[PDB]
């Protein structure tokens, strides 16, 4: 049900970390201040990797065309994006970050 991402200290606020899973598409973990969030890594507008994008607050900008998503809600923040990003439950326990196997129901 959960995947070990990294130690909460390995991520500085405002940074992104890509999580490659076996047999499944990659995910992206963002650290907005002291809280962590996760979504699909692939931009819903194409085939770009959001982990290679730019994070401003709780908004992630795609490197391909400038589309953006709110990393908390996974909702489109900037055009041309229109399709909601899948959000995955994140959990910090004993100074370590974990991500849910499947996206939130």
């Amino acid at each position: 049900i959960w995947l070990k991402v990294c130690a909460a200290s390995d991520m500085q606020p405002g940074t992104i970390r890509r999580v490659n899973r076996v047999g499944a598409a990659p995910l992206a973990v963002y650290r907005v201040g002291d809280q962590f969030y996760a979504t699909e890594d692939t931009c819903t507008h194409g085939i770009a990797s959001l982990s290679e994008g730019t994070l401003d607050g709780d908004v992630i900008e795609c490197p391909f065309h400038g589309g953006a998503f709110n990393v908390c809600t996974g909702m489109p923040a900037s055009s041309p994006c229109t399709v909601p990003l899948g959000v995955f439950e994140v959990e910090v326990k004993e100074g370590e970050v974990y991500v849910a196997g499947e996206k939130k129901l």
């Binding site: 598409a25 692939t42 819903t44 953006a68 923040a77 900037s78 055009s79 041309p80 399709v83």
Partner: protein, 388 residues
Amino acid sequence: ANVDEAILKRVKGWAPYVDAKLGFRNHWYPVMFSKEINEGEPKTLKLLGENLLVNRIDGKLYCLKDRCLHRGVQLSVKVECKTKSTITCWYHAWTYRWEDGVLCDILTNPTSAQIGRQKLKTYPVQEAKGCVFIYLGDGDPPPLARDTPPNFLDDDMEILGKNQIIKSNWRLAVENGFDPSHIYIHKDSILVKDNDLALPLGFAPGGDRKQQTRVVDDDVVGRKGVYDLIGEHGVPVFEGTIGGEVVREGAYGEKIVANDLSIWLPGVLKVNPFPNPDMMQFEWYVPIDENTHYYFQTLGKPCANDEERKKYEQEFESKWKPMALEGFNNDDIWAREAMVDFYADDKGWVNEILFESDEAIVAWRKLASEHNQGIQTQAHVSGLEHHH
């Protein structure tokens, strides 16, 4: 905005209208006649700057934006309808359903993550009175009646017409159609003599500004328009003079026509009665792009039975269409074209010098600015932009 901000700032009374160069979004628009679209034979057209595809499946019409989501090519370049309910792009085979535009398959990669996640833009399509109407807007559409003039949809009202593309912005067409004094250009129309019509050269206004028209925004159907009442208090001109000398006479025919004129959003005129005392004319000026419009003409006449509908059709083909729609309205076509240069740079909206009868046009401009359902923009054409 589609126009220089300096100009919009100057036309405080109808800026939204002046800015609506591409037309008003979120309104129904007639684009062709039902008999022009056959079962399983997709047809293309441009509406409000957008390339669209219309198809008939099991007798029902469907509309998809004619632009693949992938590399933006028009699907119509090489139409591939491989199953009854879908259309496949000729380039990389992305396949869409006509009913909801959903990307349901991709022949070049059946495992793509885009399948089932993307959706091509669809637009509501409705047939009425043998006319194909498309709702160029977003969300569930309002009743078609809201965007049609009174009586057009009457059960007994048999509708027949003609449609073509004219080289002028839609607004120049609308104003020419609702212009009370433009009647002067029709003074030598064959319809006048050949149908013994009474037709003045113009009107000497009478009464106050408010009495010149009847603005309608209390229509239970939601209709928004303006009635031209210049003839209620004005004295019609039948003897045109220069320096006191008569140089032209109006038509002293017996048939009284065009005494009930009204313009309705999104841009459709109702002339009643016309071209005959027992008929009515309904014509739309549909935006194709900023320089062109469909001049969708229809003539209506109550018909109690097939026998009457057939006799009506016969006289339509033999008289009305050639003598009226063409014989009378052809002069309006080049009249519209004649105004293109003055307004092409948007400066005409500031430099025009209006006179009394233009009060009807002013009323329309204000009504349209106040009650339109949206301003179509180039961004709507290429793809909405926002950093919100």
